[PDB]
Amino acid sequence: KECVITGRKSRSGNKRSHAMNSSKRTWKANLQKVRILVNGKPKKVWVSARALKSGKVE
Amino acid sequence: LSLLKQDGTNAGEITLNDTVFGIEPNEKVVVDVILSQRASLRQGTHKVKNRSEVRGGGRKPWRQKGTGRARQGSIRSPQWRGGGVVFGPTPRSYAYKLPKKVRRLAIKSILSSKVNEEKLVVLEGLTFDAPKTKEFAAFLKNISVDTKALIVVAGESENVELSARNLQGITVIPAESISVLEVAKHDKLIITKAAVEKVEEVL
Amino acid sequence: PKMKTHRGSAKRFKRTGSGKLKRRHGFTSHMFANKSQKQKRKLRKSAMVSAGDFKRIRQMVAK
Amino acid sequence: LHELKPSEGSRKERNRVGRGTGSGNGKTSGRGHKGQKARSGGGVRLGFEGGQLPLFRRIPKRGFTNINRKEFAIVNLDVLNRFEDGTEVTPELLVETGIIRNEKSGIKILSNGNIEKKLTVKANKFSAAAKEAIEAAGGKTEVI
RNA sequence: GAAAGUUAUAAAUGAAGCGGUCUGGAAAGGCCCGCCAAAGACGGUAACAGCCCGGUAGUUGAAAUGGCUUUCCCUCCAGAGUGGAUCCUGAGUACGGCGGAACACGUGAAAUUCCGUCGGAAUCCGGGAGGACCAUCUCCCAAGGCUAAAUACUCCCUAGUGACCGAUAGUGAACCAGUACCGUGAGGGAAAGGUGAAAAGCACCCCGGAAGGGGAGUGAAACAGUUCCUGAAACCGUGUGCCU
RNA sequence: GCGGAAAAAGCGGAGCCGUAGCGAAAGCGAGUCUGAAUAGGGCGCAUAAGUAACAGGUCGUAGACCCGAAACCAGGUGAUC
RNA sequence: GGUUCGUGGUAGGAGAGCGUUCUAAGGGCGGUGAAGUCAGACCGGAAGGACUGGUGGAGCGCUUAGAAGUGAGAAUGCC
Ligand SMILES: [Mg+2]
Ligand SMILES: [Mg+2]
Ligand SMILES: [Mg+2]
Ligand SMILES: [Mg+2]
Ligand SMILES: [Mg+2]
Ligand SMILES: [Mg+2]
Ligand SMILES: [Mg+2]
Ligand SMILES: [Mg+2]
Ligand SMILES: [Mg+2]
Ligand SMILES: [Mg+2]
Numbered sequence: 001k002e003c004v005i006t007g008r009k010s011r012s013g014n015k016r017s018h019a020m021n022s023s024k025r026t027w028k029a030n031l032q033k034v035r036i037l038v039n040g041k042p043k044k045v046w047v048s049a050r051a052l053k054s055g056k057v058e
Numbered sequence: 059l060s061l062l063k064q065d066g067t068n069a070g071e072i073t074l075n076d077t078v079f080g081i082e083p084n085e086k087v088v089v090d091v092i093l094s095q096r097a098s099l100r101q102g103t104h105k106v107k108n109r110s111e112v113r114g115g116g117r118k119p120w121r122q123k124g125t126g127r128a129r130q131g132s133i134r135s136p137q138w139r140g141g142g143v144v145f146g147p148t149p150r151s152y153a154y155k156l157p158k159k160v161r162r163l164a165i166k167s168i169l170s171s172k173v174n175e176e177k178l179v180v181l182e183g184l185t186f187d188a189p190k191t192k193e194f195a196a197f198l199k200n201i202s203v204d205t206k207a208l209i210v211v212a213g214e215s216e217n218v219e220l221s222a223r224n225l226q227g228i229t230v231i232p233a234e235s236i237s238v239l240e241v242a243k244h245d246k247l248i249i250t251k252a253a254v255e256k257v258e259e260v261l
Numbered sequence: 262p263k264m265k266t267h268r269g270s271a272k273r274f275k276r277t278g279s280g281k282l283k284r285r286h287g288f289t290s291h292m293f294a295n296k297s298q299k300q301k302r303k304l305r306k307s308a309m310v311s312a313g314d315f316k317r318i319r320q321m322v323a324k
Numbered sequence: 325l326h327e328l329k330p331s332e333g334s335r336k337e338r339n340r341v342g343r344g345t346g347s348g349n350g351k352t353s354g355r356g357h358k359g360q361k362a363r364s365g366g367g368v369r370l371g372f373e374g375g376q377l378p379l380f381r382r383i384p385k386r387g388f389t390n391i392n393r394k395e396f397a398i399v400n401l402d403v404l405n406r407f408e409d410g411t412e413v414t415p416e417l418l419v420e421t422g423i424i425r426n427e428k429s430g431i432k433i434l435s436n437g438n439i440e441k442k443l444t445v446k447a448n449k450f451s452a453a454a455k456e457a458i459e460a461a462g463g464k465t466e467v468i
Numbered sequence: 469g470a471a472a473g474u475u476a477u478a479a480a481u482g483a484a485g486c487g488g489u490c491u492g493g494a495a496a497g498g499c500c501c502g503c504c505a506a507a508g509a510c511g512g513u514a515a516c517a518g519c520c521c522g523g524u525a526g527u528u529g530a531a532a533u534g535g536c537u538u539u540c541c542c543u544c545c546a547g548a549g550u551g552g553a554u555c556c557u558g559a560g561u562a563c564g565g566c567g568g569a570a571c572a573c574g575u576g577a578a579a580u581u582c583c584g585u586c587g588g589a590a591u592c593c594g595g596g597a598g599g600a601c602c603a604u605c606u607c608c609c610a611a612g613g614c615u616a617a618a619u620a621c622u623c624c625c626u627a628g629u630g631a632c633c634g635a636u637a638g639u640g641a642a643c644c645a646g647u648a649c650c651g652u653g654a655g656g657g658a659a660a661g662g663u664g665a666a667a668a669g670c671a672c673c674c675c676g677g678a679a680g681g682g683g684a685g686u687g688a689a690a691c692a693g694u695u696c697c698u699g700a701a702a703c704c705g706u707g708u709g710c711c712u
Numbered sequence: 713g714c715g716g717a718a719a720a721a722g723c724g725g726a727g728c729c730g731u732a733g734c735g736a737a738a739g740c741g742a743g744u745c746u747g748a749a750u751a752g753g754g755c756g757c758a759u760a761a762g763u764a765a766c767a768g769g770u771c772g773u774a775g776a777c778c779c780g781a782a783a784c785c786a787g788g789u790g791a792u793c
Numbered sequence: 794g795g796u797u798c799g800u801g802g803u804a805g806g807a808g809a810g811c812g813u814u815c816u817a818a819g820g821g822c823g824g825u826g827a828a829g830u831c832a833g834a835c836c837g838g839a840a841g842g843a844c845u846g847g848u849g850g851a852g853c854g855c856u857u858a859g860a861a862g863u864g865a866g867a868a869u870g871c872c
């Protein structure tokens with residue numbers, strides 16, 4: 001579960017209350033399942049919205 | 059004081075510098091420096107295992123209450139037979155140096171003591187054609203040593219170190235390497251004129 | 262390891278020439294309607310740490 | 325080496341507690357009976373007052389530290405007498421002589437004592453009294 | 469790829485007392501004479517050995533394999549000056565908002581660095597930093613990559629060292645120990661060293677089914693007898709001087 | 713750190729403490745701060761000794777004189793009861 | 794060297810010491826018997842130390858300094 005173009009993926013960090021109690025959470029990448037052809041042939045792969053922004057296959 | 063050759067014959071006299079060989083010995087300082095130099099020789103490679111370092115021990119041997127036995131926390135607690143040692147030796151250095159000025163006073167004072175006691179013998183040359191222990195032994199009889207003795211020499215004289223190596227009470231050192239503990243360990247101090255120059259040059 | 266200075270104390274005490282500690286007075290924020298002008302003049306000045314207190318804290322501020 | 329005598333009173337025998345009642349430090353080993361202070365690792369932290377607000381929290385913080393604080397090496401007149409009469413006394417000369425080893429932010433001349441010799445003394449700063457005193461002897465103070 | 473050198477992995481050679489005498493089971497010990505020493509390290513040998521043995525200092529040695537260092541081979545190779553028309557100098561990047569994190573620095577006045585998300589430059593007349601930020605000045609040129617040494621650690625190997633332990637210590641483990649044993653399992657996890665210099669380890673006789681004894685013999689010693697140096701205390705007995 | 717025997721010296725003065733304090737600070741300096749003050753008062757000076765090393769005592773950080781919970785958390789092992 | 798006043802003691806402060814293992818250096822003891830062990834009617838103010846004899850069968854004191862795993866009757870302590 002990772003951007004094939006970039007390597008964007010889940011990363012951990014803290015959620016913080018007011019009162020500053022910390023608890024572990026993640027930040028997932030905005031991955032979208034899309035058809036592209038990195039290899040000559042097309043295929044459905046995870047790609048981040050950020051990677052799609054600008055020029056990509058679709 | 060008097061200046062005599064390997065053969066043992068007199069070769070005039072030599073004037074030792076009174077700021078090195080003349081000063082009133084400070085015994086208290088010499089003792090402090092001797093103790094420090096003895097302490098600095100220690101390797102201090104000793105260790106025991108404390109209750110954490112001993113194999114096993116993990117679990118509570120039996121429940122806290124009800125069994126009628128003394129409460130115990132680990133089979134490696136210190137009161138247990140094969141258990142951890144409570145304090146005991148840990149690897150450490152014993153080395154320490156007194157200030158430079160005290161260390162210089164100590165060598166000056168130990169050398170002055172040897173002159174006062176008349177244990178210092180100043181040799182013109184001291185050399186050997188080839189490494190020969192029989193010749194070095196004969197030399198010591200000509201000087202009339204017959205004790206432990208520190209021999210101090212300047213000119214490379216490789217044959218002097220080798221010739222004295224197998225003799226038990228005898229230590230041959232450069233002159234740069236003269237130390238309070240080495241002078242204290244030996245009764246007589248036989249020094250070559252060339253070495254005296256080198257010792258005075260430093261002190 | 263080195264002893265650590267007590268930073269709370271290092272922000273409040275100052276060491277004098279003789280080696281004593283000088284401090285400020287407490288009651289010197291707000292509630293000034295409740296204190297007299299004489300009180301105010303006195304509280305405004307510095308003070309020395311007492312012998313009793315000094316014995317308790319001197320290691321905290323060595324260095 | 326068989327007659328070593330360390331200076332009398334330079335070395336003392338360490339006190340060993342918990343080695344019997346004869347020594348006076350047996351059993352409780354100088355700790356008395358029970359309470360926090362009798363326990364291994366026992367005792368409250370340094371300034372602790374058993375919950376009474378500690379002294380340092382009763383009294384306010386004061387002041388700030390200047391990032392640009394200058395601290396001058398101080399040279400009082402008395403040490404200038406060391407130098408010969410009609411001598412030029414610079415910072416480089418004061419450190420060569422060893423009168424000031426480190427020259428923090430510069431060298432400032434202060435009046436403490438009195439001066440006898442005539443000197444041309446250059447320093448980064450002088451106290452009003454310094455300048456007067458050097459000149460009163462017959463010197464010329466320069467500010468580098 | 470060669471060649472030469474050198475180191476490692478076996479080894480070789482190697483001085484000087486069967487010296488006299490005393491005690492002893494035995495001499496390396498005592499006393500009295502010698503001797504070698506570039507060798508008086510260590511160990512062994514019937515008690516403590518430089519000269520008895522293995523050795524030690526010093527001096528030699530490698531068919532084979534591996535390492536290292538050189539040299540040769542082989543392979544590879546453009547680098548100064550002068551202008552500034554124009555062109556190039558890392559983009560979803562830098563940066564910003566929001567949410568986190570790393571920065572000694574807890575969002576703070578919070579620079580600097582990174583992550584997610586969204587927005588999103590300039591591009592030499594350009595860009596970044598100097599702890600908000602602006603201006604000036606100064607120093608630098610991001611968004612591509614590589615790079616030895618000085619540093620960390622030791623399952624190992626070689627040679628050594630210790631005011632480290634000496635069998636309840638030191639490794640859990642000096643001994644067929646991660647064994648025995650416990651646990652369904654993960655896992656937990658012991659105890660246990662010493663005959664003598666040498667087996668000379670008790671032929672033979674006697675009691676006894678044997679065990680075990682008593683002689684005899686060995687040995688310096690057997691009250692050193694195959695778990696056998698020493699052999700404390702608790703505890704168990706026999707005998708008896710005084711008492712009951 | 714270099715040098716060296718897991719030496720001893722020698723070299724190494726970077727740095728550290730002391731030789732001046734007062735003030736939040738700019739600063740001034742045998743004074744300084746406060747203050748309109750040449751006032752009074754605070755802290756200093758007039759009443760120089762420190763520093764390096766070792767040893768004793770005590771404290772701090774470390775398990776910190778020794779033994780002892782119930783518990784908590786992390787990775788595993790168990791439904792042959 | 795005298796004089797005067799003192800010398801009960803828990804927590805606790807202060808001082809002087811005894812003994813144990815190891816190191817250095819001096820100087821010794823030991824197969825004509827070391828250490829250990831057993832016994833005793835000996836010596837010192839205490840911790841303690843000798844001597845003599847038995848056992849034991851090979852190592853060990855002493856002096857001065859140094860360093861500590863340095864002293865046990867209690868922990869429902871461990872073996
Ligand atoms: Mg553990
Ligand atoms: Mg019971
Ligand atoms: Mg525990
Ligand atoms: Mg065991
Ligand atoms: Mg153990
Ligand atoms: Mg206010
Ligand atoms: Mg004492
Ligand atoms: Mg008491
Ligand atoms: Mg008691
Ligand atoms: Mg109690």
Ligand SMILES: [Mg+2]
Pocket residue numbers: 357358
């Ligand atoms: Mg009470």
Ligand SMILES: [Mg+2]
Pocket residue numbers: 355356357358359361362
């Ligand atoms: Mg108490």
Ligand SMILES: [Mg+2]
Pocket residue numbers: 375
């Ligand atoms: Mg309260």
Ligand SMILES: [Mg+2]
Pocket residue numbers: none
């Ligand atoms: Mg031979």
Ligand SMILES: [Mg+2]
Pocket residue numbers: 492
């Ligand atoms: Mg005989």
Ligand SMILES: [Mg+2]
Pocket residue numbers: 515
């Ligand atoms: Mg024997």
Ligand SMILES: [Mg+2]
Pocket residue numbers: none
């Ligand atoms: Mg032997």
Ligand SMILES: [Mg+2]
Pocket residue numbers: none
């Ligand atoms: Mg952020």
Ligand SMILES: [Mg+2]
Pocket residue numbers: none
């Ligand atoms: Mg932080």
Ligand SMILES: [Mg+2]
Pocket residue numbers: none
């Ligand atoms: Mg900026």
Ligand SMILES: [Mg+2]
Pocket residue numbers: none
């Ligand atoms: Mg962002």
Ligand SMILES: [Mg+2]
Pocket residue numbers: none
């Ligand atoms: Mg920036």
Ligand SMILES: [Mg+2]
Pocket residue numbers: 598
């Ligand atoms: Mg700035």
Ligand SMILES: [Mg+2]
Pocket residue numbers: 599
């Ligand atoms: Mg800053």
Ligand SMILES: [Mg+2]
Pocket residue numbers: 609
């Ligand atoms: Mg650039």
Ligand SMILES: [Mg+2]
Pocket residue numbers: none
């Ligand atoms: Mg064991």
